[PDB]
Design a protein around this ligand. Structure first.
Ligand SMILES: *[C@@H](O)[C@H](C[C@@H]1CCNC1=O)NC(=O)[C@H](CC(C)C)NC(=O)OCc1ccccc1
Length: 188
């Protein structure tokens, strides 16, 4: 069946409730003090993490080389706790997946597992008015309150939930190379 045990281990050790001016989002911690949140959360200079105001030391809204939104924002947080390093659970490449789980961690839903079934590399989506790339699709009627939700199969953390049209849901891909130590460049 679905990898419920894996999703639960990821929720236990690597998720927190994040709250911006746009409301609450499940937030996946990736390594050290680096986490991700859907870009439409509109992250600013500070953010609530588990209802604790926290300094946002960096925020990078990912876009691809066509200058198209990827709907992922990576943040660096001023907190004492380190996140378990889960980078080795991220996919190297784009892919399709079987029998995935969507897990939510908010105030309203502290832990929440939804089997969404098959996940297809959808590609381009006009995501409520914003052209977006690298989208994963599942045939499940996801709802408000689920954004940021972590999409997993066993051994792989494959994306975070960003939208849904009433019949399908949509996640932004997570790729391993989003989080490697790289080069020295001016990004703001
Ligand atoms: C989470 O903030 C929320 C989840 C949507 C909401 C309804 N059901 C879901 O799964 N995301 C959005 O509302 C999202 C925000 C954009 C700025 C990314 N917009 C959205 O989902 O629009 C509906 C739609 C999605 C895909 C094709 C056509 C319409």
């Amino acid at each position: 069946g679905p990898g419920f045990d894996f999703a639960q281990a990821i929720m236990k050790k690597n998720t927190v409730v994040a709250r911006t001016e746009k409301g609450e989002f499940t937030m996946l911690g990736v390594h050290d003090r680096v986490a991700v949140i859907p870009t439409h959360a509109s992250v600013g200079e500070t953010i609530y993490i588990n209802d604790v105001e926290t300094k946002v030391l960096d925020a990078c809204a990912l876009r691809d080389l066509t200058d198209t939104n990827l709907e992922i924002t990576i943040v660096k947080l001023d907190r004492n706790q380190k996140f378990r390093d889960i980078r080795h659970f991220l996919p190297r490449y784009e892919d399709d997946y079987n029998d995935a789980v969507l897990s939510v961690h908010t105030s309203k839903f502290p832990n929440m597992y939804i089997p969404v079934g098959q996940v297809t590399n959808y590609g381009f989506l006009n995501l409520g008015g914003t052209p977006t790339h690298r989208i994963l699709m599942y045939n499940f009627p996801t709802r408000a309150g689920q954004c940021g939700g972590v999409v997993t199969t066993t051994g792989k953390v494959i994306g975070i939930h960003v939208g849904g049209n009433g019949a399908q849901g949509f996640a932004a891909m997570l790729l391993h190379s989003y989080f490697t130590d790289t080069a020295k460049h001016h990004h703001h």
